[PDB]
Every structure is written in C-alpha cells, then in structure tokens.
Amino acid sequence: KPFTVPILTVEEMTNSRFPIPLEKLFTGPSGAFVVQPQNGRCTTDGVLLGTTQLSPVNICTFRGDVTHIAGTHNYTMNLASQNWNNYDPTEEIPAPLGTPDFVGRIQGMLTQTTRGDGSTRGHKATVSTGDVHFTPKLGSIQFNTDTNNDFETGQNTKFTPVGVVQDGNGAHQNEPQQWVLPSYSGRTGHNVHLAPAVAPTFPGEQLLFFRSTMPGCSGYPNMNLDCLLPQEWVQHFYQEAAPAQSDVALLRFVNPDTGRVLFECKLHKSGYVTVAHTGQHDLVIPPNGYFRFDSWVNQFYTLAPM
Amino acid sequence: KPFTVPILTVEEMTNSRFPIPLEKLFTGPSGAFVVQPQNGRCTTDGVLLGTTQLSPVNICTFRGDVTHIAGTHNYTMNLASQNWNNYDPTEEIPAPLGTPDFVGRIQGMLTQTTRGDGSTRGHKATVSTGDVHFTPKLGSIQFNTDTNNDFETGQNTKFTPVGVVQDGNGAHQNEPQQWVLPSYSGRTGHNVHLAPAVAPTFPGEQLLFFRSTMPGCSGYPNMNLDCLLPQEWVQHFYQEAAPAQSDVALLRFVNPDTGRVLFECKLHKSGYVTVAHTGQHDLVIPPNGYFRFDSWVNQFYTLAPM
C-alpha cells in the first residue's frame, strides 16, 4: 500500500491539540523550548502516540462524575473513559486520551443530565492544568464553575472546551504555555509513556507547525497553538497503515490551479515535519494549496530552501 | 477509481450535524416527519449539498461582528464566513455553511478578541434557531447572553456551541425538533436551495441513522440527534471523488475479529443509508465493527434482513 497524505487544504483541516480549525503554516526556531506535545502524535504508518486519539471533537474534553467542594464553586471530576466506561489508570499512556498537553487555564462549559428524569444543566467552568488538583492520570481533576449547588452526584457530566484565559499581574500573553506539559499525576509522580520531544537534526532546518489561534475568554492570553500534524492526517495514517519505506517522506506543497510547487518538506516517519528555513515565518500559501507525497528519502536529503 | 468508505468504527467518528462523537446506529420508520437535514449532506462522488462543509468543529458555529440591543442582554451578530471573509447572501446555498439545521435553542459561549491589544472576553450565550430574529440566510442572528455591556463593536466574535436547552411548563422533550428546519430567512422568505428530503423507496426498508446524544444545558431537552452520514464519510467522499457506477452502493458491516458480516445496507449515491428492518431499533454492534464497500448494485437489489 502506497503512502499518501490527505489532499485537504490547510483551512479545510483541524488542529490536533484543541478543537478548532487550522489557520496557517508557521515555522520558527525551537531551540529555547522543548517541543513534546502529546496530542497530534501519530507515526506515518498509523500508530498513535502519547495521549492521541482519533476524534477531533474529543480533544480537551473530559467526562465523568462530579462532587461538589463544599463552601466553594469548585467540583472534582472522577474521570470516566471517553465512552463512559471505567477509566483505567494502569494503561501505558501518559493520561486519558485527549487530555490537554499544555499548562494553562481552559474555559468551557460543564454539562450534566440526570438519567432518571432527563433534567439537564450547564455552567461555565474552567480547568487549570498547572494546578495541584490537575491529576488526570490518577483519574481526578478539578473545575472552577459558576455554581455552588446545581450539579448532582452520580450523574454523567461533560466538559466541552471553548478557549483559554489569562489571569494575574503577570506580563501579557504569559499564559498559556503551549510547550510546557502538565504534570499528569500532579505532585505525586513524574509523567510516563510520553511521545518523544522533536527537533530538527539537519543543518538549516526547522520544524513546520500547523497553527491555529485559540479563542480567548478573559485577560491577555497567548492564543497561538501549534500542532505537528493536522487531526485529519492522524485519522488518515491510522486508517491507511501504509508502511514507511524509509525514515523520511518528501512532501511537496502544490498549487492545484497552476500545478506549481510552492515548497517542499520532510515528513519524518515518527510524525512531524521539517522545512529548510531559519527564523520565524508565516508561510504565504494559496488557499487551495495542498501537500502531496512524492518519494521516500533519508534524513540527509537536502530540501530546496523554503 | 474504486469507491471506498472509511474503516473507522462508529465510535471513532463524528456527528455531521453537531460537533460531538457518534454513539450508535439507529433505524426507524420516518413516514410521519420530513427527513431533510442540511448538514452531513454529500453525494458518494464528493459533491457537498445543503449547508454542509468539511470541518467537524465548525458545525453550528457562528462568526461575525456583534452589536448590543439597548435595554436587553441581547446582541445581533452580522455574520461572516467561517474564515472571516464576507458572507454573500446571494450564493445558492440555504444559509451560511455549518448553520444549524434544526429548530431549537443552542447554548454555548460567545468569545471575542480586541485586535488592537489582545484583550479577550467570553460569555455564556444562547441562539434560538426558531425565533423571529434568526435570519442567517440574510446574514444576521441574535444571541441572548448574560451581559449588556461587555462585547465591543467592530471586533471578531465567535460562537462555540455546547448543547441544547428546553424551556417552559411545556411538555418534556418538546424541543429541539431535529427534523424541522429553521426558516433561514425568518418570516421574510421561504427556504431555498435545500438538500432533498430522503425516504426509503423499497418495500421493507428504513433509513439508517448515525446517532448521537447532544449535551443538555437546561430543562428537559430532546437530545437525540441523527445524521445521514458521519462527518468523516463526508470528508472521505469529498477527497476521493470516486465515480458512482450505479445509484446504490452495497455496504457490509463486518466484525474484523471473526471476519463475519453482521448486516448489509444500501448507501445511496445521493448520500444516505437504508437497511431492511421494520420498527424502531437500536443496533447492537461489536465496538470494532466497520463498514466495507462491496459492490455497485442495481435498483432491484433486495437487502438481507438486518
């Protein structure tokens, strides 16, 4: 089976780290950061890595039952799996699939149905993934909400993410921090089963990022969100399971109207893209442009400069 | 080019009428109501129909600029397209792409960024698709919110849907009404350019629906939501654009563990599925089962009983 990537254009695709569309392609130097996202991680032959799962809408959602923290507007959620089965904390994953992979405050809504009579309720809620109560690997997290009485125990409860918030007397755009992983077990333990950090290894190369702007809900948040693979590419590799014939697939980005190649890039078998460029750059592309697999090369292939 | 459907299982796929996962397959008699959804509509050779677009996360989202209605907590939104380009009310589509295709109250969050300084804000908000102000074909809708002063004019504003609500001392589960289309032009005009209504046309057949349960945010809503095609099938057909060799594709639903066919169904070229069954039925399926295209058949093919 021949390897392929989707022909969907960048704006026709979805960010793999938050449920929002892609907006653009971005390249920048990453030496100052550790680039180790856990969502949007998939090998080219369809092996999911880290906390990656297949659904574009389950990214950064949580499901489970909640318990009120008396005297506050906070609730603890005991997590269930994404299909309401028991959560298994012994699975060899860093955290439940789809768990956020950055430190920040995510605002959205908590919703609940009472199974007995079908009564429902929904409240604005925020989860702070850097807080000591954020322990998804252990099966528990905390939300700050807009009620101190409405949610019931023993009832299915869902968190739908919307955007990010920034608080404090800190500098503008100081949070979220998209390249800092939460501690999935809080302070009890270190992160386990992580998808590896990625970095360019060939001279003159940088990572190529698929970038979106997260909605902001309060303050002055850093809304940039970069993923290594579109979610639709994850679904595609997962289904095709095309075997890699070398360590690097050469892709060309093509304009369909003219047939002309705009740039070329390396898709590494372990699931990330590099380009030959130095410095921060928002790539200028035709709206109908798309990526096309052209051939198998090695890690020492010299790309045409972007 | 041979026709194929995705091998993703039902639980690995997304509802095409609301941004939530599929949960199950359902069949029932549909003679009493009109089955004319506008999202999740696509031919097998990849022509999108109705208000259908490619992104799972832009379903029931709105974008545009907002203006406050004095003396209230309501805002009018002047709609933009999903990539912030101007919306053209003269295109031969029923309403902007991704516009909700059922009458009900959809609750979510309105979020806004001030372009000049990166300040952000977000509020709970509801849009009632059956109300007199819901005129998305004409380019405007109204939101009910919990503020009367916070949103700014002339700034990009996004609505992220979360769930549905039901109000009043009315009968439980009376709304939403998933098979009643909004009037996209309100009372000024009638709906146009709709994807056709669908019905079984062969004796003993019923529609097969891909079913989800919408989150409920208030009251006693009817949370069932049936789509004709999973969103991933829409993206797949759009990309492949395989020619239809007859009006009916025979699909088999297969258990990969045993290799045995569980049931068969007809995928019609114009984009919906039928099965041979009479009565309301929640299909019981193995979690790893999937659809497989087997052959093009003629108009006289009789399906094996489901």
Ligand SMILES: CC(=O)N[C@@H]1[C@@H](O[C@@H]2O[C@H](CO)[C@H](O)[C@H](O)[C@H]2O[C@@H]2O[C@@H](C)[C@@H](O)[C@@H](O)[C@@H]2O)[C@H](O[C@@H]2O[C@@H](C)[C@@H](O)[C@@H](O)[C@@H]2O)[C@@H](CO)O[C@H]1O
């Ligand atoms: C606390 C509670 O259950 N309240 C009931 C109330 O329902 C609340 O109505 C107010 C409007 O004043 C808000 O819409 C609340 O969101 C709503 O509470 C929601 O819905 C109820 C049924 C529960 O599921 C709750 O968990 C959830 O937060 C209700 O008012 C009636 O029903 C509501 C939904 C609305 O349609 C009203 O117009 C209507 O009078 C009353 C009477 O049924 O009962 C209260 O106990």
